[PDB]
């Protein structure tokens, strides 16, 4: 039952600010593994 | 005695609408008593 008047003018959203450079430069290739685990090999190659 | 009035200036001082050019653009005239200022979080962890 209030009498008063009120008028909007402005509803701006902060936002912070986030940009993933490290996955969209370096981590580029994308595989799904249905599996348990998975495997990662290197192999050394100092011959003497 | 006669005389003449050749010249006569207005003295100012150096003022000049800065910021309210720059920074304030969009007048908004309101017939209303009273305004509201909104603002929203937008933070998620």
Redesign the interface.
């Known amino acids: 039952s209030m009498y ?13 600010k986030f940009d993933p450079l490290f996955l969209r430069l370096f981590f580029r290739e994308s595989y799904p593994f249905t599996t348990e685990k998975v495997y990662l090999s290197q192999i050394p190659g100092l011959v003497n």
């Open positions: 008063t008047t009120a008028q909007l003018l402005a509803a701006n959203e902060q936002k912070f």
